[PDB]
Structure 1
Amino acid sequence: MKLQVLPLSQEAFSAYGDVIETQQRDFFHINNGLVERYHDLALVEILEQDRTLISINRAQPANLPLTIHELERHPLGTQAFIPMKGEVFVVVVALGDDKPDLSTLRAFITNGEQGVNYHRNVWHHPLFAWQRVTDFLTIDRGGSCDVESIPEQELCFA
């Protein structure tokens, strides 16, 4: 089953989470104008844990052609990923209350200038780099989530 990978945008990703980027986003000038502050880009949410967690996930690149078969979901908290050095990366998402609703499965490749923030219960493929090793700053609950199998998918670019 082929799954076309589309460019990442806030509009197309609205149902799964937030896109962390500055392009076409509102900001406040701070100081003489030395700093531009692009406020509230991602809705962080953590349940059953007063403290949020900041970590660094160093993910290896995946074998090409990419072909996922599993999906995870964190019902207890959101999870953000921001490339450490501005590298491009891929994400696969899907909705569904019980199991992943295949009709809502989507694949997105970033422009190398945007991060991502998965909303609670959103199904997404486990982290993996694209082309070369990559460091991702993570912002989530990360405690102890839900893995589910799906019909093998072969990601395509076109």
Structure 2
Amino acid sequence: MKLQVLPLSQEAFSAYGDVIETQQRDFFHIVERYHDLALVEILEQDCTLISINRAQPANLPLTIHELERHPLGTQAFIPMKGEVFVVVVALGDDKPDLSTLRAFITNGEQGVNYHRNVWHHPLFAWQRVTDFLTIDRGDNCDVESIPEQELCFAL
């Protein structure tokens, strides 16, 4: 199944989570504070931990066949050296709702925070080893397979 990879934007991503970036975002003059870019929510009396995931770059062509989700907590990933990366998300209360399945490629100035219970693909890098500043709990996530998806970058 062809899965088109489109540019990431807050507008297109809003139903899946928050896009962490400064472009055209409101800020307070203090230092310029670009506030409330993402809301971290971790329940089940779990801790909110900061980590770094060093991911190897994946090579084209890319195919996926499963998605994971964190039912009781959000998960944020922010590249540490301006790297571009790819994300795949889907909604769905008990399983991925294919009509909402989408893929996005960042612009190098963005991070993401997946809302709780939102389906996404395990972390992987693009074109180069990337260190992702990670904010989540701390494996207690749900794993569900989906029909093979062929990510498409052209067009």
TM-score between both structures, scaled by the size of structure 1:
0.94
Percent of residue pairs identical: 98
After the TM superposition, which of the residue ranges 86-95 and 62-71 deviates more from structure 2? 62-71
SS of equivalent residue, structure 2 residue 11? helix
Unmatched tracts of structure 1, length 5 or more: none
Match of 1:11, SS? helix
Paired residues, number = 154
- Tell me if the contact between 1:61 and 1:130 (Cα under 8 Å) persists in the aligned partners: yes
Radius of gyration: which is bigger? 1
What does the per-residue CA deviation read over 1:35-89, in whole Å, with 9 as the maximum and x for residues that have no partner? Answer: 1110110011010225311000111111310111110000010000000101000
Q: Deviations over 1:3-50 (max 9, x none)?
A: 1101000010010000000000011111xxxx1110110011010225
Contact in 2 for aligned 1:49/1:141 (Cα 8 Å): no
SS in 1 for 2:128: coil
Cα–Cα, structure 1 residues 50 and 70, in superposed 2: closer, same or farther, change >3 Å?
Answer: closer
Q: Any idea what the Cα deviations from partners look like across 1:101-139, whole Å, max 9, x if unmatched?
A: 111100000000000000011000000001111000001
1: distance between equivalents of 2:98 and 2:137?
Answer: 26
- Asked whether the equivalents of residues 19 and 37 of structure 2 are also in contact (C-alpha less than 8 Å), the reply is yes
Which ranges of structure 2 fall in alignment gaps of 5 or more residues?
none
Deviation (angstroms), 1:143: 5.3
SS at match of 2:73: coil
Q: Which has the higher strand share?
A: 2
> What residue is the counterpart of 1:44 in the other structure?
40
Partners of 1:156 and 1:102 in 2: CA distance: 16
Cα distance change of structure 1 residues 93 and 50 upon mapping to structure 2, 3 Å threshold: closer
Partners of 1:113 and 1:144 in 2: CA distance: 30
TM-score by length of 2: 0.96
1:157 aligns with 2:153: yes
1: distance between equivalents of 2:46 and 2:85? 30
Q: How far apart are the structure 2 equivalents of 1:57 and 1:128?
A: 9
